[PDB]
């Protein structure tokens, strides 16, 4: 099959190389720290001695390092060896850095595809993998078959920063939800309730994750019907959360933050509308 | 069946009275603003004239208004009639306000039950109905059958404010999650991405065990990072820098950042994100 190069042998990089090898790709690997490829070489991987030698061994080069600052530090020595090849940046960073990488890649004659892995390494090489991809459509189709070895490719568009945008946007949701759960856990924990007793209920407050698409209809329509629950009614509930958190001894930074956003919308005349109307103030720094 | 009184005929109050009427309970209803009981009265409801007659008409009095100050203003005239009866307060408020109501009820000779409706009005009367209850166990056992008309009773304990604490905490999670989703929708929208195209992916990330898994790290006090708070914080930095460049407000993600920085300054950057609970506490 097509030869592929994985630059960076961390937890994810090692999984990526393994998935390429399992699909029959002659995989050339390289890492700054030696002693992490023993399992890959036993499966067929060729350990390269130089980044430039690794970049020159395959038509497709996948780089999976911590940030782009590292990606640019590793690949500058081989910046020209990227000649005529495609760089698949599966490093997670900002949309701006993905666009600067693309321009940097074009400067050195290389094609560029920006990717974002949305699963842990164990799920690479399996149908559970969700990898976003953005950049020139032709380049994706030309290498879609090779990238299938990693899992579920999902082309988003031509803008190199799209994949990163989806990435930071989905991590924005995940960590913000994370913080709310931990705050709720602490609040009930102030009265001795084990988190194991609150967790089955915290699963029910979300029931089917339908709200995602119900509110998306409002956002896309720009119409936030405040029928039933209004933003001002919801804001009253936040006040109860803040005063309960204060009374119970828990920090009230996060709930006050959500309260500030609600007030901003109410100050913009959305008091009557739904909570989804808070997006109107979220779009204004 | 047992007679029941419903004080407050807003969307929820009318749903509660209808659920009692369906279960065969003789239901007396009453509300400050007239003209909302026609459907209930056609199904058997008895519209009381005064709140003191309504309170006096039933052994079980269910009050469901906007807040605690409203219940205290609308029952203050009939505080004497409450003696010997049971006030089941389904009005959502703070745990402290729940403990105060129980005391006020006791001073007037009434048993008190604090409740928290976690479902919308349409779900009342249905198996999906989730209503938390707290207060003395005996009073709840005396009226479990009558309260079953409203749906899934979940008796939490004896503390009158316990049901309200579960209430605020689940709402803390719900609204915080809502805020994060809107911010993520705004972030993808800065590049024209329709919220309807993002919703399917937002679901895939949520794939529901993260609640129970962290509950054990929180119960054990052991936050093993392998993902560590230090790395997670660097991604939250990317969210802020990206949002600022994309023209999106950074207040909310920065609030999340301040929380991870607090736990890091406490010596948890090598623990899990779950360890944030320690600074929350
Ligand atoms: N759960 C996951 O693991 C997961 C899931 C989705 C996405 N990702 C993304 O995938 C990428 C890889 O993550 P990871 O799990 O492998 O851990 P990581 O610590 O983010 O990256 C480890 C890799 O980066 C290399 N590296 C970092 N800084 C370097 C530098 N200055 N010079 C040279 N190499 C450098 C490491 O080299 P050494 O090995 O020599 O130290 C190693 O190969 C990250 O961008 C991460 O956000 C990870
Ligand atoms: N319906 C829901 O979606 C839902 C779901 C779960 C929990 N809850 C909670 O359960 C309760 C039901 O709320 P709701 O949806 O019915 O609407 P609401 O606006 O929260 O409650 C309004 C009710 O309280 C009365 N009221 C409010 N302020 C009053 C005052 N100052 N003096 C006298 N009466 C006053 C209203 O009388 P008027 O009708 O005359 O204005 C009406 O009966 C609330 O505590 C809510 O937080 C509601």
d(C-alpha A67, C-alpha A84), whole Å: 24
- Would you call B69 helix, strand, or coil by DSSP? helix
d(C-alpha A80, C-alpha A77), whole Å: 8
A217 touches chain B (CB under 8 A): yes
Tell whether ligand 1 has an atom less than 6 A from the beta carbon of residue A225.
no
Sequence-distant (≥ 6) Cβ neighbours of residue A103 within 8 angstroms: none
DSSP state of B93: -
Buried b (16+ CB within 10 A) or exposed e, B82-92: beebbbbbbbb
> What are the beta bridge partners of residue B114?
B89, B134
d(C-alpha A123, C-alpha A88), whole Å: 19
- Would you call B92 helix, strand, or coil by DSSP? coil
Asked whether the beta carbons of B192 and A181 are under 8 A apart, the reply is no
Structural tokens at position B66: 């906007």
d(C-alpha A120, C-alpha B168), whole Å: 33
Q: Which residue has the tokens 């369906």?
A: B22
Total Cβ atoms within 10 A of residue B36: 17
Q: How was this structure determined?
A: X-ray
Q: Which residue has the tokens 């129970």?
A: B212
Asked whether the beta carbons of A15 and A9 are under 8 A apart, the reply is no
Sequence-distant (≥ 6) Cβ neighbours of residue B167 within 8 angstroms: A240, B92, B116, B118, B132
Q: How far is the CA of A210 from the centre of ligand 2 (A)?
A: 25
Q: Which residue has the tokens 């403990």?
A: B99
Sequence-distant (≥ 6) Cβ neighbours of residue B116 within 8 angstroms: B90, B92, B131, B132, B133, B163, B164, B166, B167
Tell whether ligand 1 has an atom less than 6 A from the beta carbon of residue A73.
yes
d(C-alpha B154, C-alpha B115), whole Å: 9
Q: How far is CA A249 from CA A194, A215, A253, in A?
A: 17, 33, 12
d(C-alpha A158, C-alpha A169), whole Å: 18
Tell whether ligand 1 has an atom less than 6 A from the beta carbon of residue A115.
no
Strands (DSSP E) found in B31-164:
46-47, 60-63, 86-89, 111-117, 130-134, 152-157
d(C-alpha B8, C-alpha A271), whole Å: 23
CA distance A272 to chain B (A): 16
Sequence-distant (≥ 6) Cβ neighbours of residue A118 within 8 angstroms: A130, A131, A132, A167, A170, B204, B205
Asked if the Cβ–Cβ distance from A219 to B182 is below 8 Å, we say yes
d(C-alpha A12, C-alpha A123), whole Å: 10
Burial class (CB in 10 A: 0-12, 13-18, 19+), A222: exposed
Asked if the Cβ–Cβ distance from B176 to A179 is below 8 Å, we say yes
Asked whether the beta carbons of A131 and A177 are under 8 A apart, the reply is no
d(C-alpha B134, C-alpha B156), whole Å: 5
> Ligand 2: residues whose CB is within 6 Å?
A 228-229; B 8-13, 31-33, 64-66, 70, 73-74, 90-92, 117, 120-121
Q: How far is CA A247 from CA A191, A223, A252, B162, in A?
A: 11, 37, 10, 13
A92 touches chain B (CB under 8 A): yes
As a three-state string, the secondary structure of chain A is CCCEEEECCCHHHHHHHHHHHHCCCCEEEECCCCCCCHHHHHCCCEECCCHHHHHCCCCEEEECCCCHHHHHHHHCCCCCCCCCCEEEECCCCCHHHHHHHHHHHHHCCCEEEEEEECCCHHHCCCCCCEEEEECCHHHHHHHHHHHHHHCEEEEEECCCCHHHHHHHHHHHHHHHHHHHHHHHHHHHHCCCCCHHHHHHHHHHCCCCCCHHHHHHHHHHHCCCCCCCCCHHHHHHHHHHHHHHHHHHCCCCHHHHHHHHHHHHHHHHHHCCCCHHHHHHHHCCC
Parallel, antiparallel, or unpaired: how do β-strands A46-47 and B86-89 relate? unpaired
Tell whether ligand 1 has an atom less than 6 A from the beta carbon of residue A64.
yes
DSSP B151-191: SEEEEEES-TTHHHHHHHHHHHHHHHHHHHHHHHHHHHHTT
Give me the residue spans of the domains in chain A: 1-157, 158-285
d(C-alpha A93, C-alpha B234), whole Å: 9
Q: Which residue has the tokens 């920065």?
A: B254
Sign of the four-CA dihedral B225, B227, B231, B235: negative
Asked whether the beta carbons of A57 and A30 are under 8 A apart, the reply is no
Of all atoms in ligand 2, which is nearest to the CA of residue B33? 40
């Amino acid at each position: 099959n097509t030869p592929v190069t994985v630059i960076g042998l961390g937890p994810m990089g090692r999984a990526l190389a393994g998935a390429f090898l399992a699909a029959g790709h002659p995989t050339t690997v390289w890492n700054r720290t030696p002693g992490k490829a023993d399992a890959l070489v036993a499966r067929g991987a060729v350990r390269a001695a130089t980044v430039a030698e690794a970049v020159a061994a395959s038509p497709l080069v996948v780089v999976c390092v911590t940030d782009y600052d590292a990606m640019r530090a590793i690949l500058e020595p081989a910046a020209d060896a990227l000649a005529g090849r495609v760089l698949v940046n599966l490093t997670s960073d900002t949309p701006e850095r993905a666009r600067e990488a693309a321009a940097w890649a074009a400067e050195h004659g290389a094609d560029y595809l920006d990717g974002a892995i949305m699963v842990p390494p164990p799920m690479i090489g399996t149908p559970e993998a969700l990898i976003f991809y953005s950049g020139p459509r032709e380049v994706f189709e030309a290498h879609r078959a090779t990238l299938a070895a990693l899992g579920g490719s999902t082309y988003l568009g031509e803008d190199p920063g799209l994949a990163a945008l989806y990435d930071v946007a989905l991590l924005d949701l995940f960590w913000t939800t994370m913080s709310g759960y931990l705050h709720a856990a602490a609040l009930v924990g102030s009265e001795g309730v084990p988190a194991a007793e609150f967790a089955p209920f915290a699963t029910a407050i979300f029931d089917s994750l339908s709200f995602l698409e119900e509110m998306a209809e409002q956002i896309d329509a720009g119409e936030y019907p405040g029928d039933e629950s209004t933003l001002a009614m919801n804001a009253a509930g936040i006040d109860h959360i803040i005063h309960a958190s204060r009374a119970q001894g828990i920090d009230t930074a996060l709930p006050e933050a959500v309260k500030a956003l609600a007030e901003r919308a109410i100050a913009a005349g959305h008091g009557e509308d739904s909570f989804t109307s808070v997006i109107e103030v979220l779009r204004k720094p």
